[PDB]
Paper text:
ACBD3 is a Golgi resident protein involved in the maintenance of the Golgi structure and regulation of intracellular trafficking between the endoplasmic reticulum and the Golgi. However, in enterovirus-infected cells, the ACBD3 GOLD domain interacts preferentially with viral non-structural 3A proteins, which causes re-localization of ACBD3 to the sites of virus replication. In this study, we present a structural, biochemical, and biological characterization of the complexes composed of human ACBD3 and the 3A proteins of four representative enteroviruses.
Of the six GOLD: enterovirus 3A complexes, only GOLD: 3A/EVD68 and GOLD: 3A/RVB14 formed crystals that diffracted to a resolution suitable for subsequent structure determination (i.e. 2.3 Å and 2.9 Å, respectively). In the GOLD: EVD68 3A crystal structure, we could trace the polypeptide chain of the 3A protein from T163A to I583A. It contains four secondary elements: two alpha helices P193A-V293A (α13A) and Q323A-K413A (α23A), and two beta strands I443A-I463A (β13A) and V533A-I583A (β23A). All these segments contribute to the GOLD: 3A interaction mediated through multiple hydrophobic interactions and hydrogen bonds. The helices α13A and α23A bind to a mild cavity of the GOLD domain that is formed by four antiparallel beta strands of ACBD3. The dimerization interface of the GOLD: 3A/EVD68 complex consists of the hydrophobic core formed by the residues L25, V29, V34, and Y37, and an additional intermolecular salt bridge between the residues D24 and K41. Analysis of the crystal structures of the GOLD: 3A complexes revealed that the 3A proteins formed either one of the crystal-packing contacts (as in the case of EVD68 and PV1) or contacts with the second 3A molecule when two GOLD: 3A complexes per asymmetric unit were present (as in the case of EVA71 and RVB14).
Residue numbers in the entry:
A (entry chain B): 16 to 58
B (entry chain A): 363 to 436, 473 to 528
Write the structure that this text describes.
């Protein structure tokens, strides 16, 4: 398990869906399910 | 002694494959937001108990949109992390990250305030590290 700042440097430099999926498989990044996020609207 | 957390600078970048991002994101409705004319939409993302960082991605279909990030401390104190600015996220996928200053809630603000005539479609995704 690398350091968070390492994950960050990798994704910043080489970002792709493939690299994201890999990071996700390894559990280096964990997706926030969008249905659990509170969304607010304002005018 | 008490001290005020030093807040790390956020990172921001883009990546070219926008069609694929939206297609991936389109597979779930809740990840697609409609921002009406003159409207501002806020997505609340709490810090996870096991999390170090927040990572975000977003894109739009036909037009730019304002994007900024704020951190809400759990009236409540609010810190400006990414100042709101218009991005051309219709052209590319915009992504970024920020290190947790502490426990609280991030506010991702998608700001259409300036648009008299246009609704926007926002595709977004967020992850966290440990």
């Amino acid at each position: 398990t690398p350091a968070p700042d390492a994950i960050n440097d990798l994704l910043r430099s080489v970002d792709s869906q493939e690299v994201r999926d890999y990071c996700q498989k390894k559990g280096w990044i964990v997706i926030h399910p969008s249905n659990e996020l509170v969304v607010e609207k304002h005018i | 002694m008490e001290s005020l957390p030093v807040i790390a600078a956020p990172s921001m970048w883009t990546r070219p494959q926008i069609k694929d991002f939206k297609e991936k994101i389109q597979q779930d409705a809740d990840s697609v937001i409609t921002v009406g004319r003159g409207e501002v939409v806020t997505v609340r993302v709490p810090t996870h108990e096991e999390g170090s960082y927040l990572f975000w991605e977003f894109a739009t279909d036909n037009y730019d949109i304002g994007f900024g990030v704020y951190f809400e401390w759990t009236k409540p104190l609010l810190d400006e992390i990414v100042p709101v600015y218009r991005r051309d996220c219709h052209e590319e996928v915009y992504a970024g990250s920020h290190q947790y200053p502490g426990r609280g809630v991030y506010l991702l603000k998608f700001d259409n305030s300036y648009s008299l005539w246009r609704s926007k479609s926002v595709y977004y995704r967020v992850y966290y590290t440990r």
